[PDB]
Structure formats: C-alpha cells, structure tokens
C-alpha cells in the first residue's frame, strides 16, 4: 500500500537498475594456478618444512590441536593466518597417514 523509496531503513536509497559487468582482472590476484601449484609443492619436497611447522605437526599428531593453534598464533601472528596454517598442517599430516597405509 504505497511503497515510496526512503532515504533510511534496510531497503533504502535510490532505486536504480544494476548492470552486471565483467569483474576487473585485478580482482583475480592470488588465485592459485595449476602450474604455480606444481612449482609450490615441487619445492616443499626439496626444501621441506620449517622448525615451528614441524613442532606444530608433532602437537597435531598428539591431538592436542588447541595448543597447536595457540603455538601457531604466537609464531605467525594473527589468528586467521594461524588457523589457515593449522589446516594445511593437518592436511599434510593426513596425506602422510594415507601414504603410510598401503
């Protein structure tokens, strides 16, 4: 019953039709490429792991995974980086465990 557009409240603002353009090429940066992935993990079997990483793997093995994160946060810095690292380490540890079982 009369829906005037308002300058204030939830579905607010001037009602205008939206174009749905191609997203800028700048926005795709950091997207992991097939060839870059190969390079990345090709080097993780040359260079191997860091010391703090290794220590965290040993915690994760024990299933003491909060203490693992508490350690990684103090080491890396942020929570979000620490959490993302802990998942990688848990993935690595799993693919070792799958590789051993054969």
């Amino acid at each position: 019953a009369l829906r005037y557009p308002m300058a204030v409240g939830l579905n607010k603002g001037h009602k205008v039709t939206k174009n749905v353009s191609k997203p800028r090429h700048s926005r795709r940066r950091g997207r992991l490429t097939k060839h870059t992935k190969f390079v990345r993990d090709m080097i993780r079997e040359v260079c191997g792991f860091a010391p703090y990483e290794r220590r965290a793997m040993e915690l994760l093995k024990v299933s003491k995974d909060k203490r693992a994160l508490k350690f990684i946060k103090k080491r890396v810095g942020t929570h979000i980086r620490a959490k993302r690292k802990r998942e990688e380490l848990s993935s690595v540890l799993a693919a070792m465990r799958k590789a051993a079982a054969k």
Binding site: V39, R40, V46, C47, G48, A50
Partner: protein
Amino acid sequence: GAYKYIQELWRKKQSDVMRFLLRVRCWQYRQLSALHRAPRPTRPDKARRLGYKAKQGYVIYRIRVRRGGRKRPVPKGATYGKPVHHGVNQLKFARSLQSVAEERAGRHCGALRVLNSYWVGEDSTYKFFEVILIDPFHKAIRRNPDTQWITKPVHKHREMRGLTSAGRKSRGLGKGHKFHHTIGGSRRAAWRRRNTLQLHRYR
C-alpha cells in the same frame, strides 16, 4: 621457468637447504671487507625484479652494515636538556639498514648511479646487502632507451636524497588515510603548506 622455482625456494628461508646456504654465505661474507664488488648477483632472480639486466655497465657491490639501533652520540650521557630528551640507548634511526647500505655503495662509487638493493643474509652483528649500480655514461646504457632515464642528472645520488625503493620507505608516503603527513611532496612540504600564513590581498 627456473626463476619462479628459485623465487619459491628463497621464500623457504627457514628450510634445511636455504638455512645451510645462508649460514655458509654469511660466514664467507664476514671473512671479507665491508665493501667489495661481487662479480655477479648472488640473487639473480631478485636483481631482475628490481631491474638489473645482465648486460655491460650493470654492477653489484655487496656491502656490509652493522646491525642494531643508534645510540645518541653525546659524551658520557649528558644530553643536557629537558628530561624528555634524556634518552641515549633505546632509540632508533629513521632510515633502514638497507638504505644505509645503498647510501654507502653510492658514496664510494660516485660515478655509479644506485638503482636498487636486496638482502643476502644476517649475522647478529652485521647485515649484508647487494646494491645494483649503473654507469650512466656507458654507451650500452646511454643508447638503450629504456635505461637512459638514469643518465639524466636529476637522478644523481638517488640514495642520498631518499629515492631508491629502500630509502623511499622512511619518508612515509603512500596514498590513503594512513599518511596525510606527506600530502604534498613530502613530510617537510606538508608542514610547510600547513604553516604558511597565506595572507591575501583583499582579506
């Protein structure tokens, strides 16, 4: 291509391989003078991203820099003054060590024109660096159009004026809210603008 590999390896600096090498390099460098001209770039990869090119008239000095902060050069303590300024020990230089490294490479080779530097290791006592230099008057640079900007005499002593990538960083200039000081040319210039009585004709 090999460069991408090299690049990714060098990021694994805590790795067993690169740690071994860095220890051996850093030992070796420590056993030489504070400034020597490397025959080729320790880090080929990095040098290319910074703008080295493996042709004549590009040079690379490896320069040592003593590490840690900056104690206030005053006899005994005796920074006579208000006890705000009593500090001598825990205070820290504006420019980086890497800039100091370039500045020294620049000082030494006056003809040479500092382009850019990169890191090659660190002991407790020292850091090590590798400053890419360029002859502005070697024909291969002069005649190459893409470099011949360095042969212009505004680019004399970049490192001394705070103009290499490294010595840029101390100046504290970037776009956006996290700056404002340096919202003219530079830190000094904004202050200058902000503390001018503009006194107009008509008022």
